[PDB]
Amino acid sequence: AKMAFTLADRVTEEMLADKAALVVEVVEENYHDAPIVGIAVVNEHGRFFLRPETALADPQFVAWLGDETKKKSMFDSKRAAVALKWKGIELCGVSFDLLLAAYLLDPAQGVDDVAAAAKMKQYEAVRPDEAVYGKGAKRAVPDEPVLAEHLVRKAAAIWELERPFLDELRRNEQDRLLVELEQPLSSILAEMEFAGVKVDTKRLEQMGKELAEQLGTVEQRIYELAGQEFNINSPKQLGVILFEKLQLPVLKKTKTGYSTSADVLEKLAPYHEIVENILHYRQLGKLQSTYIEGLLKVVRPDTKKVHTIFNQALTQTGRLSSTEPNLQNIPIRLEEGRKIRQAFVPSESDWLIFAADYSQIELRVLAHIAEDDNLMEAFRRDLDIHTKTAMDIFQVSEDEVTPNMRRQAKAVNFGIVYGISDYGLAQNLNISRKEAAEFIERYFESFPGVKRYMENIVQEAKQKGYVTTLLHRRRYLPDITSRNFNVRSFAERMAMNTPIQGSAADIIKKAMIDLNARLKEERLQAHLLLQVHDELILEAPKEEMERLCRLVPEVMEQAVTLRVPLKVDYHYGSTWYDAK
DNA sequence: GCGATCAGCGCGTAC
DNA sequence: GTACGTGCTGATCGC
Numbered sequence: 069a070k071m072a073f074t075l076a077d078r079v080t081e082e083m084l085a086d087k088a089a090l091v092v093e094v095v096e097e098n099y100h101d102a103p104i105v106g107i108a109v110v111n112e113h114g115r116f117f118l119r120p121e122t123a124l125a126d127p128q129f130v131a132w133l134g135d136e137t138k139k140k141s142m143f144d145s146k147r148a149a150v151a152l153k154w155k156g157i158e159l160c161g162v163s164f165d166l167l168l169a170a171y172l173l174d175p176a177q178g179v180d181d182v183a184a185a186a187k188m189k190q191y192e193a194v195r196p197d198e199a200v201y202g203k204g205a206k207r208a209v210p211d212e213p214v215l216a217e218h219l220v221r222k223a224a225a226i227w228e229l230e231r232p233f234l235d236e237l238r239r240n241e242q243d244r245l246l247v248e249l250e251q252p253l254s255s256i257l258a259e260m261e262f263a264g265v266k267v268d269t270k271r272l273e274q275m276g277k278e279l280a281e282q283l284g285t286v287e288q289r290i291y292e293l294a295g296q297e298f299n300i301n302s303p304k305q306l307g308v309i310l311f312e313k314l315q316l317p318v319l320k321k322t323k324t325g326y327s328t329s330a331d332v333l334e335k336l337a338p339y340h341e342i343v344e345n346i347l348h349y350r351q352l353g354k355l356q357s358t359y360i361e362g363l364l365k366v367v368r369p370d371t372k373k374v375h376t377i378f379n380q381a382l383t384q385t386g387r388l389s390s391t392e393p394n395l396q397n398i399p400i401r402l403e404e405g406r407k408i409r410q411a412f413v414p415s416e417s418d419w420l421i422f423a424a425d426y427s428q429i430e431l432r433v434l435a436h437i438a439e440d441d442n443l444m445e446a447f448r449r450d451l452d453i454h455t456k457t458a459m460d461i462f463q464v465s466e467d468e469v470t471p472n473m474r475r476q477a478k479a480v481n482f483g484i485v486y487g488i489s490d491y492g493l494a495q496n497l498n499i500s501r502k503e504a505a506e507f508i509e510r511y512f513e514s515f516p517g518v519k520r521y522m523e524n525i526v527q528e529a530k531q532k533g534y535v536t537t538l539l540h541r542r543r544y545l546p547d548i549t550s551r552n553f554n555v556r557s558f559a560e561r562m563a564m565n566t567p568i569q570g571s572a573a574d575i576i577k578k579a580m581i582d583l584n585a586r587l588k589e590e591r592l593q594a595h596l597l598l599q600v601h602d603e604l605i606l607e608a609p610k611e612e613m614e615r616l617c618r619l620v621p622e623v624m625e626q627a628v629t630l631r632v633p634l635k636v637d638y639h640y641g642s643t644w645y646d647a648k
Numbered sequence: 649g650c651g652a653t654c655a656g657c658g659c660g661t662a663c
Numbered sequence: 664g665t666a667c668g669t670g671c672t673g674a675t676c677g678c
């Protein structure tokens with residue numbers, strides 16, 4: 069049965085009620101400077117469809133959109149807010165975002181459209197977006213009649229689903245998490261994405277020119293050593309050259325053939341000179357394809373800025389994800405890749421990039437939740453945690469800790485945070501399973517509180533069916549009761565890791581909200597550009613650096629109060645690379 | 649059967 | 664452990 073609604077030719081007063089389900093449809097996946105294909109409003113007076121060209125040109129509608137006292141319920145309001153920002157229109161008063169609500173209730177549903185969220189409450193009087201717009205190469209906006217009914221049905225679902233979703237959130241004690249954390253953060257992310265980050269395109273192009281030369285050279289060297297030409301990027305063609313032709317040892321295999329991962333290649337290097345060249349080729353290729361060419365493809369030619377989109381409703385732990393381009397995985401560990409950061413610069417003259425990062429926030433969070441006396445004392449003394457762990461595991465003084473000892477203790481620490489397992493650590497340190505088990509046993513003898521937490525959290529996950537974070541975010545783990553060892557194993561590791569990774573996410577998210585409030589109170593021009601899980605990147609006039617040096621660390625360190633101190637390091641400079 | 653497309657995944661970056 | 668972009672490739676689409 070068709071849903072009744074008014075296909076409006078002009079905006080009327082009843083469309084401007086102080087409470088409404090609002091749909092501002094942006095079909096393009098990347099909503100930056102994208103078209104708004106239609107608008108739908110559902111309130112106490114009825115259901116309406118408005119053509120964007122009409123509504124967005126109407127002074128009354130635009131004022132209504134920007135009136136904080138006129139409440140709107142939406143699905144993915146950030147998408148609409150940003151699309152509107154590009155049109156110079158402000159969106160205010162969003163009091164409920166169904167996407168964020170669904171995400172908090174259960175990240176595992178993969179809810180990416182109104183229909184998926186509605187299905188959670190037995191509401192199916194709305195079609196999935198893919199059914200209406202199509203998929204891939206056949207994706208397209210349908211004629212007005214079809215488009216109009218779809219947007220109205222989505223607004224109608226939002227209108228009806230608000231109460232049930234808020235009730236369940238309240239039951240889960242997650243209503244504040246939605247209203248005080250995620251929704252306010254959504255607005256901050258919209259500002260960050262809209263602002264974008266300035267790119268020194270000529271610097272990237274220059275790097276691309278040099279890389280192209282080095283690539284060609286290494287490429288020819290590889291063919292000379294292989295005794296023939298082939299597609300070095302082909303797993304089967306490379307696997308044949310290395311393991312069948314050159315007969316190098318097969319140390320590891322994939323599900324479809326031979327493994328050629330970097331760690332495997334490193335072990336084969338001694339056997340043939342072609343190996344080091346392949347590694348070099350891949351190193352150069354990674355930078356060229358993903359960080360040079362890939363980055364240049366998404367830079368806006370008119371402003372030379374990249375505008376990422378922070379997916380706020382995707383990760384199972386509460387973290388954000390970044391796309392087109394992903395600005396959360398720009399190289400930093402190795403100098404060759406780190407240089408890519410010299411290309412990210414301040415958007416204005418006499419401005420600088422300012423970066424602040426939490427020092428070991430996940431291990432500090434673990435110390436707090438596990439209430440492990442030894443670990444808490446270590447952080448209270450602000451000790452080098454990996455050296456400290458080496459001292460405990462190997463039972464030696466600080467001076468007796470060798471570089472290799474610290475390296476292995478470091479790996480144990482990461483394993484503990486990620487959800488420890490003898491098999492896992494054994495692969496990471498290239499040792500036997502029995503040897504890994506010994507490291508783990510030694511670790512738990514030194515950190516009995518951590519051991520207890522790991523045991524208790526897995527049992528809690530089984531009893532309750534989910535695990536939670538400091539701010540009440542939750543993750544269901546049905547596989548915790550799987551009869552398949554491997555499957556259950558993953559679930560147990562997720563039970564151990566989620567509260568840590570997730571609580572770390574809750575903390576930085578609150579820090580972002582607190583920071584923006586302080587920047588505004590202080591009248592600073594400084595503003596957030598990016599968030600990379602445990603760090604925040606801002607840009608501001610050079611005249612604001614000294615104040616930022618005191619303000620940013622304090623806000624981030626005081627976001628929450630834990631049993632151990634929170635520590636934030638910071639640096640600033642002319643480019644992202646220099647903010648080190 | 650085959651070119652175009654889609655869908656899975658090895659790989660390598662980040663934290 | 665949590666992600667994303669990439670290039671290749673087997674599966675599936677569309678003739």
Ligand SMILES: OC[C@H]1O[C@@](CO)(O[C@H]2O[C@H](CO)[C@@H](O)[C@H](O)[C@H]2O)[C@@H](O)[C@@H]1O
Pocket residue numbers: 097098099144147179180181377379380381382391
């Ligand atoms: O607007 C981001 C928001 O939209 C979803 C779908 O509801 O993802 C879409 O947009 C992302 C950013 O462009 C794409 O990566 C994704 O492929 C596309 O479906 C949500 O997952 C996200 O929170």
Ligand SMILES: [Mg+2]
Pocket residue numbers: 425426427428602
């Ligand atoms: Mg750090």
